[PDB]
Design a protein around this ligand. Structure first.
Ligand SMILES: CC(=O)N[C@@H](CCC(N)=O)C(=O)O
Ligand SMILES: CC(=O)N[C@@H](CCC(N)=O)C(=O)O
Ligand SMILES: [Mg+2]
Ligand SMILES: [Mg+2]
Ligand SMILES: [Mg+2]
Ligand SMILES: [Mg+2]
Lengths: 370, 360, 360, 370
């Protein structure tokens, strides 16, 4: 039955990384993890923000999102009783944008709700996969052959897709040079919203090298130019930043802006909207796959449960947690073997904050009540 | 945790109208609860392609042996365990919808709540058949407007369309008014249908072929009145194709026609992503089907009124213990887990023509 | 020659309306002059996605450290020095617009003149909220017509649109009349919106989703009244896409929403290249923002009247020393270099909630 | 503040060339340079006409343009006070066409105005590049290999694009034969409004040889056929003659007539309109690059300042002045090194008439006052 949200904790942690993540919007080495914990009916839901300190991947920031949480979202929900996560989400007024901020509340609500039922999260969302295929995305690196080697280390691990982050002045080389050593691997690029329609003919060269897709080659907020570019090349386009809702997905696919969607749960505003994005794509015969945002095991586990839905037909960016952190914020390991990630068992996300360890890396912590 | 389907009953009832109606039921048993669903296929293929005879064959020979004795994580897993077979969406909906009801009852949660709805009441419309003349049409619309219905549906046909719509809109300038064209028209009728445009109908329902989308798209370019699709939307990919082709701007969503609740929610979500509304169509359901419908209707893109009016308008006495009665054009969501309604087993037995039990 | 940005102040004022409004200001100091700009983001994300809290964070932690102590050839160079970051156009506009004002003041040249304008006065329109009934609408339009406004904007909403427009056009057959639909409609409203067509509105402003262009394109095919875009044009490439898709024929151009003066001139020029007009939208600005707006509005494709009406309509007392008062629907361009207006520092201090200074 | 135009000089010079310019509209060896000097507020603005004695590249002529200047344009502006170059341009009535003639006035006005402010021209137009990438365009020449050698001399100089003027009965050869010796150079052709849609399949052969664009292959005044041809070949089209305004640019790009625009400042009517053309292209994600019209250092310097704007993303035709003249009309050298041309320093254009030398090559000179 119904659930009452009695308290909310905001806990910000920073976690040292392991590899250096050198995307076309910059280089990333460390990681701030904004956690929202919702309390009610003797259980708790935890979710993790995917917004950055500065607006580099997309428009939101930790600073603005916490203001929004403490000044607006949390007051609207605290002390209130809800029938389900859709009602929580409904209660956050008509505020514009800020999907990731909304996702912290909404996804925590899903975790809390599932835990009141004693049911796994993926199960309530309609998924019945018991593990999910994952690939790896490899940041920018080295040179023509001396990067066919980092691919090597991952193909030997059984990862089911290799994604190379390219960018203006570094692209066609690895692709032929990886299709070189590995003529048969599922291979993709993250063209990193780097290019413009100007760069169209160069991108067509990637065509023979048989990629499953080219990811977000043009502006992060664009659909129209992508639809133009898609007509000029044979390699399918994959959208990321430009699909932030199910109607964006509908428009992108009706326009022909892409044939594949990188679905990032928090980017589209949470699980319910992700299911819609997922079903909209499916109705167009377009697959989705699960994006990653360097999450701790909270975010990683949310991603894994979402990925159990049936239109997740391409390997996601949900590789092994041990790849990123010497120690994660949860107790459970989230380790893929042979490119298959198992669904962590238990109610909701199936994972559990390591509170003692979290405390040692916490830099902010607030409680909110009605 | 997961649920095992241990047993299934098929009960075929002949329920007196207020002539009879054959009501096929499926009851799935597991975990100390049961799920019940109602078939909407007819004895002969009239509204669509399926029949009771073909459907019950498929259930007992194929669908039921596939699920009996198996353990499932959710209703989607039950449905997936049947996905090799083509079409037969109403037969499939029987299993799928009973599975939803069973699953919800293992959790103790209302069905609509599990599907993501949070309405406590749903808006209901009324359907009128062809009347003898204009004033007889207007007198019955006036009755139903006074009862508080929030949408008026008129059955129209070639020779009788502009007249009743005109007379009605004249008497009732501001009501929500729609028509059901019952696939009785052709593209040569475009000029006549366009004559409806000045009376601001919310939509015209399925004027052209029952399985068509493409000619509906053409007709939509020729008239300004929105088209509502019925029989040609039997899946989420049909809804996508319909909306993207401009075959219509509204979908009459019938849960069993598209294959059950999960696929219905996908139709609802696809429509929503296009900013097109859906509404809940009806099929003369006993309280089992009516309750499944009321629960589906609590979802937020059900933005036009549905054919889930009072059970008492159809049946002397219903097969369930709970009254489903709308007041002032609002049907309350029946309280309880799953559908929130309960078969009256003794009354049921007095109207049962045939029953059978199946185990693994 | 080039300019060095030596210092920046953020002042947040609470300015009494004639209830209060929070007015965030940025003052950039260099070369013995200063540039001032005003933020248009709200405390919560209502008109669009940004907030004062998020914006000020971005300024002090990112934008300001990027420019403090650096030397620039022009305001475009200042803006380029921030181009790694995504969205946040109003936060960016604060820096960009102060940079324009500073730059113009190092040269001794009016801002509008540097952007290529040569109007000495700009035409102003009036905005009316929902009134109780038709005659109350007409009485207020009559007032504003007599004051000499050159465009009447009516706020409309579902249930209240054709009536006020009809009553107004009936009383005023030749005035320039427009409506603001405030994203309150859907494609199902096409038939109702088309009913506005006979009253010859100059445009309907953003009837569908605030961030949409594609559905607006569809709606434009269904009705003959021109659509004006607001929130879905946040850049020159948005303006191009909007005009080329046929999402609208007019753009409500708000300087801070698109990221400042340079990008605004690009929106203005793209529109012009399509032969589509722009007009200057408003955001309840203190005299700082109003003056930036008046200066932008002097450009030649600002061919419909703008929301830069009298400061006295909003504020008991303004933050600047100069009165910005329109007479007979003409707002004079404030004289002087840059914006031609000057902060009243002592009055400002009496209404300051928070201030801070930043250096390299 | 405001500026008053008190006097105007028209000075026509002829300058001996150095190389023979053998375009598909004819062979050019010498060069008439129409200069307009505007006087006001103790400074002067100088601009240079790009119209020819005869209408070979486009429709204007020196003869008709000077008539228009002396009979119409100059009378409208002399003794008048203006707030900026846009107001000067506004004051030249609604006269039709004659963009180059208008450009002499307008561009001189920009120079004059910038000089009253003491600011560089490019700076006022919004550019902040400190030098610009340039290529070379090579007229019609020799044969298959014995022209891969003239390309040679330019690649050794570091020019960042090589453009070959082709024409019916001389085209596919050098391209494979230059892509031959120089498999990696940025290479283009100036198809010289020579062809018609008839010639479409031959042009598609240039496709593998990897040109950045094919320039104005069809009629000089056409958009529609270019949009058709663009659909038949993979090499982007570049428009020149057919874009004479920002609305022409809008129409060309909305139609798909080209993906690149050769922006010639005087052809579109001056700096302000060039900025608009530049921004319109940018809004479509189309680059521009700077055309050349064999200018003396006055025109060359105007071109360099315009080229500082951000959508000038492809190398222009603004090579070294020493390539064209044994002596230029200005004092300053305008020499590129390694395909980079520096912005000449100083207010306005940053260059200065060499009046003593100009006098020795002047063939006409008039003063006009109010
Ligand atoms: C922080 C986020 O922007 N980083 C990666 C995703 C990293 C993934 N492997 O977890 C990205 O490509 O978006
Ligand atoms: C006079 C003009 O028509 N000649 C060259 C441009 C020459 C450039 N290199 O300066 C052209 O191709 O148009
Ligand atoms: Mg990515
Ligand atoms: Mg019906
Ligand atoms: Mg408005
Ligand atoms: Mg040329």
């Amino acid at each position: 039955r119904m659930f009452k949200i009695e308290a909310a904790e905001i806990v910000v942690a920073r976690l040292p990384l392991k590899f250096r993540f050198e995307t076309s919007f910059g280089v990333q080495t460390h990681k701030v993890v904004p956690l929202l914990i919702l309390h009610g009916e003797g259980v708790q839901g935890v979710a993790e923000g995917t917004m950055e300190a500065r607006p580099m991947y997309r428009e939101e920031t930790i600073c603005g999102a916490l203001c929004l949480l403490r000044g607006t979202f949390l007051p609207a929900i605290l002390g209130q009783t809800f029938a389900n996560p859709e009602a929580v989400s409904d209660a956050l007024g008509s505020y514009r944008g800020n999907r990731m901020a909304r996702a912290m509340v909404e996804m925590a609500a899903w975790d809390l709700w599932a835990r009141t039922l004693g049911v796994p999260l993926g199960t309530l969302l309609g998924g019945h996969k018991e593990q999910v295929e994952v690939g790896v995305s490899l940041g920018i690196q080295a040179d023509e052959q001396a990067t066919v080697d980092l691919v090597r280390r991952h193909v030997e691990q059984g990862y089911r897709r290799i994604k190379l982050k390219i960018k203006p002045g570094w692209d066609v080389q690895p692709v032929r040079a990886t299709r070189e050593a590995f003529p048969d691997i599922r291979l993709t690029v993250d063209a990193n919203s780097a290019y413009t329609l100007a760069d169209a003919g160069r991108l067509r060269q990637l065509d023979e090298y048989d990629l499953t897709y080219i990811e977000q080659p043009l502006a992060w907020d664009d659909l129209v130019d992508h639809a133009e570019l898609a007509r000029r090349i044979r390699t399918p386009l994959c959208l990321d930043e430009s699909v932030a809702s199910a109607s964006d997905a509908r428009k992108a696919l009706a326009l022909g802006a892409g044939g594949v969607i990188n679905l990032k749960v928090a980017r589209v505003g949470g699980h319910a909207e992700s299911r819609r994005v997922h079903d909209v794509a499916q109705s167009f015969g377009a697959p989705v796959w699960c994006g990653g945002m360097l999450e701790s095991g909270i975010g990683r586990a949310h991603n894994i449960h979402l990925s159990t839905l049936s239109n997740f037909r391409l390997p996601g960016d949900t590789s092994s947690a041990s790849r990123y952190w010497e120690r994660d914020l949860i107790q459970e390991p989230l380790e893929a073997v042979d490119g298959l990630m198992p669904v962590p068992q238990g109610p909701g996300t199936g994972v559990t904050l390591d509170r003692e360890f979290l405390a040692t890396v916490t830099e902010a912590q607030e409680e909110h009540r009605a």
